[PDB]
């Protein structure tokens, strides 16, 4: 009941980190969509105009989105490993309670 709780806490820390990463990815995606709509509006327009470095903001946001996606993937893998190890631990704990 004490070396068993630390695995639970590791699992839950990974879960919380995943939720944070996902709520950050949400904001990054919203930024990307907004800048993309601005660029589409500039495209549909006939008259020429400076891009005002909107493409640079788009590139920055795209880099942020890719970084966050890779982070979420790695967190998913870590969470899966932690879940398997926790399954083994709780197997042992049920065994030791049934004995």
């Amino acid at each position: 009941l004490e070396e068993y709780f630390e695995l639970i806490d590791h699992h839950f820390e990974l879960r919380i980190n995943g939720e944070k990463l996902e709520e950050l990815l949400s904001e990054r995606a919203v930024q990307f969509r907004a800048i993309q709509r601005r660029l589409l509006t500039r495209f549909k327009d006939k008259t020429p105009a400076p891009l005002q470095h909107l493409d640079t903001l788009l590139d920055g946001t795209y880099k942020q989105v890719i970084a966050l996606a890779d982070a979420v993937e790695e967190n998913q893998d870590n969470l899966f490993q932690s879940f398997t190890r926790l399954k083994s631990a709780t197997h042992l704990v049920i065994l030791l309670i049934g004995l």
């Binding site: 509006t41 549909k44 327009d45 006939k46 008259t47 105009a49």
Partner: protein
Amino acid sequence: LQPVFTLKLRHKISPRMVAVGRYDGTHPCLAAATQAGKVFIHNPDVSLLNINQTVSCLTAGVLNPELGYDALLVGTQTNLLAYDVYNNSDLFYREVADGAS
């Protein structure tokens, strides 16, 4: 004198693009260009109109004297649009190709 009224509108007004027009027929309102190619309307709340295109002219007047409404005009370097803000309906959306300076 003294300013008989004052107010603060959160939108940057493009310099030469301002008009006053009774868009409700008897209720005068303010039409003024803004950044991003949007034209705002102050009724006495601010209402946005997506021109989605860099405005270059703006006025308001009586275009058909049969009715008593002011028509909001919006010029762009390749377009020209009359707008009946009350019953939102294009009076005419002409494409100039010479510009609206």
